[model samples]
Target: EALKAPVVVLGAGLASVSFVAELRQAGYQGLITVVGDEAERPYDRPPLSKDFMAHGDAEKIRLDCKRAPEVEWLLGVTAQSFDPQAHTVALSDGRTLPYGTLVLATGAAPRALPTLQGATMPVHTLRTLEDARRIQAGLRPQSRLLIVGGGVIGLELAATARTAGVHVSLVETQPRLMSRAAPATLADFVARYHAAQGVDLRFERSVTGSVDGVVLLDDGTRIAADMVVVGIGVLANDALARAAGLACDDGIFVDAYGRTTCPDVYALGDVTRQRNPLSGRFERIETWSNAQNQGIAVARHLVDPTAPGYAELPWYWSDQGALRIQVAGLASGDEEIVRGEVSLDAPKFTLIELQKGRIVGATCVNNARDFAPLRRLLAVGAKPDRAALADPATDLRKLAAAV
Candidate 1:
């Protein structure tokens, strides 16, 4: 395949970087332009709530692209609109760029609370590095910090803030913490862990609003706080693609090849509603691994059409304080198998999700070393002997080799 015209990527996050790097690696030596709204260059987002928030280290979290193909980077500018028919993208700074190929990696924005729609206080969302820095400044020791979500980001911030001796209180509408992200067992374990760390675990509660530096709950209880952080969720940035007449639901719809409805236009990462082979439905996989791997796979296919379609198992990890949680495949299953004891204090355990006698998913808490074989076994669709899987003495590597 011969490349001639310039390629334009819509975002400058990890996904865009991965696609650009993979294209270069696959021998695509063409003009590439990346447009990002943020002033900062592409950087890893996971640490924004973890280490970066805890220590205020900006240099450590920056994404290194020393080996990546060079491109024209347009920072601090928004992609105002797109014209698919004309093959041009209009920027907020009143410039339009023509492209041979367009990649929509616009990513997502943080979901805001209706109560704090236009608040004047120091409410925060940890999506950008700037957001992290501002939140870190307010997370003082003994400061009353109220978080309005219990998902991964919320729990992570809770852990980080509590470690800094900040009085933390997290309110989630769900009955359990990390309800949307983790299994019930893991959720319970995390809830207990947070409570033990002196965090006010206010589950099954809703934040009504904030007034005069106080957080009001649905039950008329008011909790005073120095700052509030909302990490409810994120919404896909697909307006540009949708307005350009591309198919979209919550996210821009894309095939396994990352092709959108329009010709020569593709979508990937968090902005895409790609198919999950296991669930047989398109979903927005908002994980670092998915963004990196999917971008590389899609870029490879674009470079060489004969390459196989990207169909890898979904995997993600969360680091809440010192606890490490790694999950692969789906979390929901018909049955579950335990490899070790699961407790608030004990850190090593792998919860395997089983569906019709086959391993479909697994969650490892500080057991990443042991989780490796289980991940491989799930990938190959192995039906290991139930007793041996539960036995601590059996070597999982040898067992996986047998199947």
Candidate 2:
């Protein structure tokens, strides 16, 4: 028998929305309530820096279904506290709601650079629609913008800023761009691409402090900027779960099924510390597709425990101006073979990273053909021949035969 008030979801991101929708699709009929902190309706976050920012349309990133599990969205209200014993959630407004099952997709918050004195000025990280809107409004020609990281968000922001005619200076503590994703060679290629676009990227530099237009560095160097945007990773929102006695790491701890140690309590998305299928290890994955699929997987497991385990390969992509870079799978603890045309004299081309004689990962520049083709292999667990892939002499298309 279902409890009087069951299935209370605390979050409104992609994972939460997807899980609620999936539950209804699977014919699980229960009272579905989504408690979202954002005042706006559930909106897509990926395009916050792209189409949505350029054009103020919430529908651009909206994932909606009219017929699936009708939900009551408690917009603008946040869960202030959670009590596991009472099986109730305390809203920011002081109301209490009981639940039999709880799903937390609280997502994450942008790391605050409080040390920087001028951090009070308006900066942007595409975490929400409001962030994009404010940044878009403040964008102007010759705006001296300083991005405080060289990750995907920072790069994408640079691309957008360039389009707005803003002069961008990026400061990264690491000596390379995308320290997690791309190798140094690939990072150099990307750095060159940014340089060509007139982006002043300073690697191995830290933003020690800031005040107004001046940002002080640890080396006693100061850089002037009209605005500074920080894109340092994320701090998971696991306070509610922690307060309620759920196991917490950087995010709520979960098994492969997205279930927590507590019964009927589940977590997913950036707010989760779950296991990865590709590496066969436990780690938190913060990505668009990863969260979406995990939400579905969690819902399926809730519907049936004997479900097939998650085995989907991981992939990520980023578009920096005209250069579209895409990659599949992780290249860790293995030797990587760098292939594709290089040298300034050679035609500018794509690069592929092969692992154990297979096309495990790749980065392509102006290579849209390989984006879809290579992704297909990783999607279905079909590993391509690395020897054939790394050899310019050997045509990968002919050797794979299927392509």
Candidate 3:
């Protein structure tokens, strides 16, 4: 057996779990050990800001790896450091693991609000199970919630809190909702939708500070809140990689095969900065689908070198009350085109992005059926007849197949 040494994996999140499972599926019989800093087992995170907030169902959000391979799990222990030359990783529990292959699946941590750091009232960020439970507990029917950042996390929580009859006031530094993720048109649509839903959407405003359960905004407006939730962004956990002298920029720098600069060491998920095929630039995709699918892809590559590198069309989805938003490939484009009319009554529309006559990206709101095929077109880099695309009678699957 070529696999003489054990395989050591860092982090016990979805990415780490998927990697171990896929490696076993690839027939790797070597010893596998997973080291995690968290106490809980691998669980789905997307539900934390949505369904879990409403129902507080822990089991419903837990990840069930029925087909996952067996491995040794070291929970509630941090990976302090690693020596690439010695091929060993030192953990916080005063143990060291020698490995033939090392995986850096350490995920990202949520960004915090500087103003509310030491606030008397509770502050929350939805990244872990405990964080979700705490936030859910505070979302009482008449509770006033102050959510900073109008991105996916903030908006999703606003919707969830509103459903629980909690009054929500969402503040964004940017002038638009989902500024980084959505097009201007789509952002406007969402901003309007949330406003109509009774969310106090404050655009171009930021929290200056907080005192005694009251938040002071940049515009000099003060509002009382039961709890303040910061959904700004995340910082990748690339400290270990950087300390080990491996290449890193915002995230651990990994190639298409998931290999870092160090030999026999690989990184994936939200911690790795890999090239986006569509954009031809290195970026960190902090999405649930990326963590799960990319982990499996890297494992496949490791098991079989001839296997294709991890290159899939980047896609993500978000649930805002009754609305579902799905996007594939690049969000911005040189040219924007719309298919199907956008209206509250109809609410089914697809926005397509074209670059040099090729499909670069597409977004669908309440149009999952249309979103599926358009996503494939982004991968194919195919150009469709603009008029035909706008036609409701046009079969998108057939159109994609022809590409």
Candidate 4:
């Protein structure tokens, strides 16, 4: 009878799909209805800025849904409001959906530059399939693309465009690329690599004005461009949750069980500000691993309330041109132990970070072989010797066992 109760899930993204699949796999015969703002079915997002831009085949990045049971998928529609008292969600199409359980996986929207709000040039921000499809037209060799922000998404797009002979320029307000979530040693390597690829990189700069196919910067520099792509960070889509009297601050506040302050209400994906196991503070984890794993965790919790609460370590990766950077745990620490070389040419390296002599973070650049053992060592708070940590010849797995 518990499983038979209706579930109305907001946002048909990875988290929503994973939740439905896990619930059924756990033997719960529930009626699940998913509401999505996009008409297209959920697709793998990582490739949207990578392969999808390089190649125009949409089918290649489509997400799998064969594992999910029967679902009433309301596509191309949005949730405008919610009524906690009525236990209902009001849709843009003038319909209200009452539910026994409400799941919010609405995800996030990209932040924009107000200065370029009315720019005549082609300005774009990527998040959905439609965004990638629209940007595809401007990726031709004739267009001069100016990418705003030096984050992962922008960096990847710059690399993708450069491959097809499209002139690419990138500008970041920060002094270096990937400053927010990457070590300085790693960011320096990426900066030098992009420069070698003929990317005109502007650091410590902001867009002051844009007109006549030119972007004016705060540093008295005007960059010529036919297209502008913004890769700024995103804000959680939690307006509906906030209106429904849920505790929200940009994102809905949720516990490990994905439960909101209001009973029978839950949130997942980039929209939920849940407790980060490592940080021990509520934070919005905007990564593919978190979306799928947290959704599965929430499903298990729903099936058996006594199940352990979600507490997975956070990790992220980015494939930018010749560099394949992978990171585990927090990016920075009190102490950093450098392994191998960080050079202009594509070089294999790792940054082993420690806080109080205990492993806290690990960053791999073209060095994926030892990433697993380093992650295990971090999980157990293994404090290996300084010599072994810095030695590229040392086997990480054997060292993990020693600690």
Please give the CA lDDT of all the candidate structures: 0.87, 0.76, 0.87, 0.87
Across 283-400, the per-residue lDDT of candidate 1 in tens digits comes to 8988998899889999998889899878888888999976899988877789888878877666678888888888888899998787788888988888887787788898888877
- How large is the C-alpha RMSD of every model relative to the true structure? 1.4, 3.0, 1.5, 1.7
What TM-score does model 1 achieve against the real structure?
0.97
**Candidate 1: worst 10 consecutive residues by lDDT?**
1-10
For model 4, the stretches where C-alpha displacement exceeds 4 angstroms are 1-4, 401-403
TM-score, cand. 3: 0.97
lDDT of the structure predicted as candidate 2: 0.76
Candidate 4: lDDT of 369? Answer: 84
TM-score of each: 0.97, 0.90, 0.97, 0.96
* Candidate 2 local Cα displacement, residue 296, angstroms: 0.8
Native-to-model Cα distance after best TM-score fit, residue 232 in candidate 1, in Å: 0.8
Q: Candidate 4 residues 249-306, lDDT tens each?
A: 9889998889899888899989989887766777888899889989999988898877
Query: How many clashes (backbone N, Cα, C below 3 Å) per candidate?
Result: 0, 2, 0, 0
Model 3 stretches astray by more than 4 angstroms? 1-4
lDDT tens digits by residue: candidate 3, 32-89: 9999898887788898888888888788877766656668889899999999999999
**TM-score (C-alpha) between model 4 and the true structure:** 0.96
